[PDB]
Amino acid sequence: SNEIPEPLQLDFFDRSQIEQVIANCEHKNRRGQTVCNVKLLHRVLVAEVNALQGMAAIGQRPLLMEEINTILQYVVERNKLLQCLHAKRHA
């Protein structure tokens, strides 16, 4: 294969800024790579989105939640394509 991930289309957010924060906040995990954990990721997300405003987002809190979850599966499938590679190499 030569698969690639689907681009994120973030509406509340600036993908450049998210990826900056991602590169800054990813950490060495016990699988041999520097990647931020999903839990840390998501509640950093909630913290930062709460850091600004809060007037009428109350109704859009769903949309915030599904978009957070969707970015979660994005990173999940990033990992999912990743792990295969090294065992491909060993094989």
């Binding site: 709460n50 600004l52 809060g54």
Partner: protein, 250 residues
């Protein structure tokens, strides 16, 4: 309610109807009910007249029952059996703070119980983190703030203190049960008294604070309270004490 609060005060009352005398499927046996079994009946030999205030209380019961069933259906049955303070506690666990505001207005109930409930959740806030605030917003949205309504900036427990402040500014008791219950819960959960409450409740009164220093080992702080007591005696700080006498000396 509408039909009658239309009317001039002369017709402002209605007799309570007589019990029974109902059945279904006309032309049938005289007695038919879906919710049966009984052990007594209200006095029908002596009738009663029903007035705006009575009807207001019955409506309050009804609308409380519906609000209960709305936020969670499981509640209508006990709502049919719940009394005023019973619904007050059910609201304490539910979170309809402004509804309790209305209920204390109508039934003239003890706001204190509401103070303990909200204060206990607010302490759980002051100790809690992001998730606690996340749930907190879900009911804090029902309340509105004149400084600014909502803003996810700043934690929930902040506007929780502020909401208590506002509820104080808009409901008053000539007897400060509310101060006392709040402060006792604070100290029962180990809370040093907040400065804003310090200043406001001193600027109303201070010796009451003094004997609660005594009661709950607030000894150093009492010592200061005494120091500025004497100093105001020397000068003028009774305003800060909620005292009004002009001061030059002792």
């Amino acid at each position: 309610l509408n039909c009658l609060r239309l009317i001039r005060p002369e017709y402002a009352w209605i007799v309570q109807p007589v019990s029974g005398a109902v059945y279904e499927r006309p032309g049938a046996s005289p007695k038919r009910n879906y919710d049966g079994e009984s052990s007594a009946v209200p006095s029908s030999s002596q009738i009663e007249i029903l007035e705006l205030r009575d009807l207001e209380k019955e409506y309050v019961l009804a609308q409380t029952r519906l609000t209960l069933a709305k936020h969670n259906p499981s509640t209508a049955a006990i709502a049919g059996s719940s009394a005023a303070e019973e619904m007050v506690a059910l609201l304490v666990q539910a979170g309809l703070f402004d509804t309790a505001i209305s209920l204390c207005q109508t039934f003239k109930l003890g706001l204190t119980s509401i103070f303990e409930g909200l204060a206990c959740k607010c302490i759980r806030l002051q100790q809690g983190g992001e998730a606690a605030q996340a749930e907190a917003w879900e009911w804090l949205a029902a309340n509105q703030l004149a400084t600014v309504i909502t803003t996810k900036e700043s934690s929930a427990t902040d506007e929780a203190w502020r909401l208590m402040i506002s509820y104080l500014d808009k409901y008053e008791s000539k007897n400060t049960l509310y101060h006392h219950c709040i402060i006792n819960k604070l100290l029962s959960h180990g809370v040093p008294l907040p400065n804003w409450l310090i200043n406001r409740y001193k600027a109303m009164d201070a010796a009451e604070l003094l004997r609660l220093y005594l009661k709950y080992d607030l000894l150093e702080e009492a010592a200061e309270l005494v120091l500025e007591y004497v100093d105001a005696l020397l000068g003028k700080g009774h305003q800060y004490f909620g005292i009004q006498a002009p001061l030059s000396a002792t």
